[PDB]
Design a protein around this nucleic acid. Structure first.
Lengths: 208, 90, 103, 97, 52
RNA sequence: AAUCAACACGGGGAAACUACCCAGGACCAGAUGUUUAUGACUGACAGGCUUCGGGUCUUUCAGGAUAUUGUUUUUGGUGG
């Protein structure tokens, strides 16, 4: 029994706590966001990740570690909570997933050239119009210094940034200093795929 | 830490029954499910981790203690229960 | 035989109901809760008993007493191996054993 | 028969307009007779710099609340079926009058 | 523990902290958010707030 | 924090808390690696000491292995 204001804000505040939680559990499984369906008595949540097998191994024990962690937190009733999972088609173009691949490497002491041009090639071959990778902080010297590695083309301004550009910021702690990882990935519009409409820059004239 | 004895059991039963206990990061905070100060489940939780009976994940000022393989074998030794013997059901 | 008295206590501690101290065992009898309140062969024959027998009558009931002191202690989870001194059972394959000591 | 109100609420307008189409669509099938409320801008105006340094610049964060009200005469049998859209960030309060 | 000074209507009550932050330097109480501003603005788009 | 780009800026309108600062007095969040069931450690009525007291102290009851002593170093820090 809430106001029309608070049912939006509670559901917003639910989602943001829930999403910061499933950063820290599902680092190995390869997290790629979620969606929450809210009902007065029923809650349905789609988790999305790359390694869908890694849940279902040990006859689905890994999901029931998560499902109790949600249930006990907000004190929801079982049956009234209804988690699924659904797989990521094209892991190449999701930003949170490809951040984790660049995180995986730079712990294990690959050069930053080779770590970026691993993923920046993997993004473009999978299917995307451009991508940028930044590795900010302290390699080699006492001063910190910024790498930026770019290909394709990458739109930075307007509304059209928000629709097209996926992006994901993070950080790696180390023995020496705190690096920052940062991967922007631009998409192509599909004809009603999974954006719909083209950019407001482009127009197309018909053939006679 | 000095715990009282009766509160100690019904935490480690709430740990054993569920598998995941949540507690507020903030100390001196009343606790739901089992009523007590939120120092009590929190400080025993990091004791288990050192021995290695559970995993600690922390998000938004909330501490989650997910109970691993060894602690399931330990708490059958503690409570005196037959195997199989929580929330790993399918 | 007294080897299988250890099988009784191993579960009772985890049953779990327990009294170890002479003081805890006294006020278990007085306040009207204990079923089966034990002693051993330790000092001083009647000193333990008078407190117990005098103590024992109010609570009511008696239990087989296991000698050596150490045996009672080993089953309780005491070593890392001190004398049991006294053993107290309260409230209540454990039910398979205790047909000796009876419902 | 207890003329029932829906009250449909959302953050986002495309996600709302699916649910209004369905809940207007289903009153075509059941044949129940079918009868916009003003939207709120929850403006929160934080100073965008963390420290006290720099020129005092302020980001404006409007959360928007679109709110529609369908209502109709309906007999409890027919209404159970209509209620059952399921969209992200949409709510539907049912209200008997 | 259990700090004995009352803190019913007080700045350092445990409700009043940034929930994420655990600190109270610059708190947004309106619409019952109870979130610190630096803490807010990192994760405002997740909550459904937007620039216009 | 010091030209613009410090000085109704740190959303910093501090009566307590906030609070870092100063004067007193408590607490252990001393995690994990020889003592003790014949009480390891723990809680308190009244009246003294005392800002106010189970901090201490004269009495003497309530609990029950959650330990103690030494060795390791966790964790905490609006410390640099």
């Amino acid at each position: 029994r809430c106001t029309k204001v608070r049912r939006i804000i509670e559901t917003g505040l639910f989602y943001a706590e829930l999403n910061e939680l499933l950063t820290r559990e599902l680092t190995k499984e390869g997290y790629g966001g979620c969606e929450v369906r809210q009902t007065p008595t029923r809650t349905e949540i789609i988790i999305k990740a790359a390694n869908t097998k890694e849940f279902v191994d040990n006859h689905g024990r890994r999901l029931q570690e998560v499902r109790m962690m949600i249930q006990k937190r907000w004190r929801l009733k079982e049956d009234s909570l209804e988690i699924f999972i659904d797989r990521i088609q094209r892991k190449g173009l999701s930003a949170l997933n490809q951040l984790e691949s660049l995180r995986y490497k730079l712990i294990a002491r690959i050069p930053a050239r080779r770590a970026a041009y691993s993923i920046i090639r993997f993004v473009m071959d999978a299917g995307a119009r451009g991508c940028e990778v930044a590795i900010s902080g302290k390699l080699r010297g006492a001063r910190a210094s910024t790498s930026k590695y770019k290909e394709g083309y990458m739109v930075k301004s307007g509304d059209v940034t928000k629709q097209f550009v996926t992006q994901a910021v993070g950080h790696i702690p180390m023995k020496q200093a705190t690096i920052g990882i940062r991967v922007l990935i631009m998409l192509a519009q599909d004809p009603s795929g999974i954006p719909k409409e083209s950019q407001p820059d482009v127009i197309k004239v018909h053939e006679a | 830490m000095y715990m009282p004895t009766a509160i100690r059991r019904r935490i480690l039963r709430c740990l054993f029954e569920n598998g995941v206990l949540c507690v507020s990061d903030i100390q001196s905070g009343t606790h739901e499910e089992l009523d007590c100060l939120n120092i009590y489940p929190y400080q025993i939780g990091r004791a288990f981790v050192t021995k290695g009976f559970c995993i600690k994940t922390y998000a938004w000022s909330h501490a989650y203690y997910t109970l691993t393989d060894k602690g399931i074998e330990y708490l059958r030794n503690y409570f005196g229960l037959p195997a199989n013997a929580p929330a790993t059901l399918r | 035989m007294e080897t299988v008295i250890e099988h009784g206590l191993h579960q009772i501690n985890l049953s779990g109901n327990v009294a170890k101290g002479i003081r805890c065992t006294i006020k278990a009898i007085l306040k009207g809760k204990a079923r089966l309140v034990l002693l051993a062969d330790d000092c001083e024959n009647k000193d333990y008993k008078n407190l117990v027998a005098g103590l024992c009558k109010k609570h009511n009931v008696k239990l087989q007493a296991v000698e050596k002191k150490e045996l009672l202690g080993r089953a309780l989870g005491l070593t890392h191996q001190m004398n049991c001194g006294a053993c107290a059972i309260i409230r209540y394959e454990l039910d398979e054993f205790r047909k000796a000591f009876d419902p | 028969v207890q003329k029932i109100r829906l009250t449909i609420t959302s953050s986002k307008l495309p996600n709302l307009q699916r649910v209004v189409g369905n809940l207007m669509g289903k009153l075509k099938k059941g044949n129940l007779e079918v009868r916009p409320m003003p939207r709120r801008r929850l403006r929160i105006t934080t100073r965008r710099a963390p420290c006290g340094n720099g020129t005092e610049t302020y980001d404006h964060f409007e959360l928007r609340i679109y709110k529609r009200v369908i209502d109709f005469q309906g007999t409890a049998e027919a209404v159970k079926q209509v209620t059952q859209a399921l969209e992200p960030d949409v709510h539907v309060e049912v209200s008997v009058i | 523990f259990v700090p004995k000074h009352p803190r019913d209507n007080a700045k350092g009550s445990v409700e009043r902290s940034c929930r994420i932050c655990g600190k109270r330097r610059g708190v947004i109480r309106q619409y019952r958010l109870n979130i610190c501003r630096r803490c807010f603005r990192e994760r405002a788009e997740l909550l459904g707030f937007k620039k216009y």
